């Protein structure tokens, strides 16, 4: 039912301080009691789980909350999961693009401020 | 011959403070004079140029210096340029790999701590 900060932590593989962070950026929330004695809900593990994946996928921490704006059913996950992949892919290509800029420049070596793609 | 900090800056597109940084991490060097009146050498533009590309390629700032250990002739560039590309590529795939982990998990949505690749 209600998990202690230390519990969510040990079971989500992240420091308590992170749950704080993830709380400051308003990604997860708590329910104080008897002298602000905080606590979290079962599902919370699911979020942090998703949050990590998200970070691992390269999604900026902010854009996380934004997509966290639209019971974390596989239906919902389908969403964040996709928008994020599609995002990952966009990045993937940006590098593949840079990889190519490199490919050309290697044999060159002019590093011309004026014309070298790597330089622009 | 000798470029003022402000000159290397305006012509390399980076703040003077960066040349400082790039000097702290020992990537470029200066030649004080008449009351520590610093100054840089012609070639220095070339380095910073390379440094930026490097950063743009994703190469960690440290590993820059290390590869800066082995007249910046197209011969030399061939080196750093390659080791870096080869590096970029390795990264490129790591994501393509993650992209796939995602691809599978999307339709799922179990986010099982136990078995979900995205989770490990
Ligand atoms: S190094 Fe000459 S085109 Fe880039
Ligand atoms: S969400 Fe089920 S395998 Fe990853």
Curated annotation (Swiss-Prot), chains A, B:
Domain HTH merR-type: 2-70
A GO MF term: metal ion binding
Keyword Coiled coil: no
Location of the DNA-binding region in this protein: 5-24
Region entry Might be part of a sensor region, spans: 105-116
Domain of life: Bacteria
Sorted UniProt keywords: 2Fe-2S, Activator, DNA-binding, Iron, Iron-sulfur, Metal-binding, Transcription, Transcription regulation
Keyword Zinc part of the UniProt annotation: no
Annotated positions binding [2Fe-2S] cluster: 105, 108, 110, 116
GO biological process, one term: regulation of DNA-templated transcription
GO cellular component: a single term: cytoplasm
Role description: Activates the transcription of the soxS gene which itself controls the superoxide response regulon. SoxR contains a 2Fe-2S iron-sulfur cluster that may act as a redox sensor system that recognizes superoxide. The variable redox state of the Fe-S cluster is employed in vivo to modulate the transcriptional activity of SoxR in response to specific types of oxidative stress. Upon reduction of 2Fe-2S cluster, SoxR reversibly loses its transcriptional activity, but retains its DNA binding affinity.
Assembly mode: Homodimer.
Full protein name: Redox-sensitive transcriptional activator SoxR
Species in which this protein is naturally found: Escherichia coli (strain K12)
Residue span relative to the full protein: 10 to 134 of 154
